[PDB]
Amino acid sequence: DPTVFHKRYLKKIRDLGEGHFGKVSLYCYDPTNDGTGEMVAVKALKADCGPQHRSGWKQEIDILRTLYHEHIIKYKGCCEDQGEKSLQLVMEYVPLGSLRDYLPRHSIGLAQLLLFAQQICEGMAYLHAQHYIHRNLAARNVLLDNDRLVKIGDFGLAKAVPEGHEYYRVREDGDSPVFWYAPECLKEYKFYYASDVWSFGVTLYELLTHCDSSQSPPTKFLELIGTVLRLTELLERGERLPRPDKCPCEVYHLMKNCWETEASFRPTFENLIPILKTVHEKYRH
Ligand SMILES: CC(C)(C)c1nc2c3ccc(F)cc3c3c(=O)[nH]ccc3c2[nH]1
């Protein structure tokens, strides 16, 4: 099947990005040894991860392989190292990279930022339809194809939510990222579908600040704090990231709705799509 990539034909060009478990690199898959082969993104378990990360890494691959949607990064296949030196994930190559790296370099208007947001919600609504939570939604983990279509990536923290249940209670977090996480995640280690919607709210905040570092969630939360305990206490008292410069009231309201303290009262991604469509169409012309 076309899902089998032979390592001997993979010609490394450069590195592309670093995720939770893995480093993504650009390769030419070149069976004819001709320079004419297809360009693909290949992700590998980080060199300084031990054997205990292998199960989590395989799960990322297993998850992405079961996903098929226009706003999810496309699984192409795997490459098995003959000689027990691991398994590599092969994906579509999207040269534009992440929203986090794209936004600072380009002047992007509000309507387009809301279109990016809408497309993230469509992909995430699809993800939740498959009974998966992402657990690492941030602008740095959202990629863009050549016509600026959103491709959600780094599924290194993703998990199946047990059937019947609204959340998954995590065992042990290697990395967080705490400034994108809902209170129930920080306190009770519970990750609801609604917890991804919280993270989406922070990602929308990132879009509206154009991923400026001085306005980043860590920078702004550390200013409010004046750390995970104090972050938890900050959010429990109802403090939130401020309204970005030039952000309309109703768009900030959308963000605040995603940050409601009670997980079950936040909008679902399905709810978010029509609202974002409406505000997008409103703010063009
Ligand atoms: C940071 C993260 C692990 C989410 C990631 N960064 C990239 C990336 C960065 C630049 C670039 F030009 C291409 C990519 C890329 C890609 O082309 N395919 C799949 C993932 C991926 C990626 N995945």
From Swiss-Prot:
Disulfide bridge map: none
Active site positions: N136 (proton acceptor)
Tissue-level expression: Observed in all cell lines analyzed. Expressed in a variety of lymphoid and non-lymphoid cell lines.
Source organism superkingdom: Eukaryota
Similarity comment text for this entry: Belongs to the protein kinase superfamily. Tyr protein kinase family. JAK subfamily.
Subunit field text: Interacts (via FERM domain) with JAKMIP1. Interacts with PIK3R1; this interaction is important for cell migration. Interacts with MPL/TPOR.
Disease: Immunodeficiency 35: A primary immunodeficiency characterized by recurrent skin abscesses, pneumonia, and highly elevated serum IgE.
Descriptive protein name: Non-receptor tyrosine-protein kinase TYK2
Organism placement in taxonomy: Eukaryota, Metazoa, Chordata, Craniata, Vertebrata
